[PDB]
Design a protein around this ligand. Structure first.
Ligand SMILES: C[C@H]1CNCCN1c1nccc(-c2noc([C@@]3(C)CCCc4sc(N)c(C#N)c43)n2)n1
Ligand SMILES: Nc1nc2c(ncn2[C@@H]2O[C@H](COP(=O)(O)OP(=O)(O)O)[C@@H](O)[C@H]2O)c(=O)[nH]1
Ligand SMILES: [Mg+2]
Length: 168
């Protein structure tokens, strides 16, 4: 049967979670997508010759630490933790997202990729070295993306699928 992989995209508002997701789903850059919309989208993709079904949850909205939200995030098998390379605050929030994932999955080994988005922009405030070193601290991959140009998009999502396969 075709394996389905439940992937969750997290990170500060405005980093490009929706743009990245819609790039994967539509193969089109969408510069405007209602920042409140949290939803899930499926795509069949060929990853290393295997057609698998991706189910991507593009998260949005305020923090909610209810039992219900924790149960829903626990459905995720892997997580993209996204920051924007021109927004320091978004990078400094990454540890919070990683800590919430570790808590809800009750594991120090959750499949995860660190994503530095907006790589097409000239306004960098987060050095690539600093981001690579954060991923090294966590023992996870780091991928540089642009939802605008499609740089890194398959790399981010497909690496996460390979991380889940190694974990299973
Ligand atoms: C960085 C902080 C603190 N300063 C203000 C901004 N902020 C913030 N804003 C908005 C959202 C969040 C935030 N944290 O974790 C999560 C997620 C979706 C990540 C995946 C695992 C779980 S499990 C659970 N119940 C979740 C929630 N709600 C989450 N989302 N964090
Ligand atoms: N230049 C550029 N802008 C982007 C990129 N990804 C998203 N954006 C812009 O960043 C803003 C937030 O994107 P959005 O996908 O709504 O972020 P979300 O709140 O994390 O879902 C919008 O103004 C998008 O046009 C990217 O890779 N490059
Ligand atoms: Mg969004």
């Amino acid at each position: 049967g075709m394996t389905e992989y439940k992937l969750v995209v997290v990170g500060a508002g405005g980093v490009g979670k929706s743009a990245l997701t819609i790039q994967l789903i539509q193969n089109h850059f969408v510069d405007e997508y209602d920042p409140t919309i949290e939803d899930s989208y499926r795509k069949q993709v060929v990853i290393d010759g295997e057609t698998c079904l991706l189910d991507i949850l593009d998260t949005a909205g305020q923090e909610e630490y209810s039992a219900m939200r924790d149960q829903y995030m626990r459905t995720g098998e892997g997580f993209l933790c996204v920051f924007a390379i021109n927004n320091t605050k978004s990078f400094e929030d990454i540890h919070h997202y990683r800590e919430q994932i570790k808590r809800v999955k009750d594991s120090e080994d959750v499949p995860m990729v660190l994503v530095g988005n907006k790589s097409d922009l000239p306004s960098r405030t987060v050095d690539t070295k600093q981001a690579q070193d954060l991923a090294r601290s966590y023992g996870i991959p780091f991928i540089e993306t642009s939802a605008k140009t499609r740089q890194g998009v398959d790399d981010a999502f497909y690496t996460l699928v390979r991380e889940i396969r190694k974990h299973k």
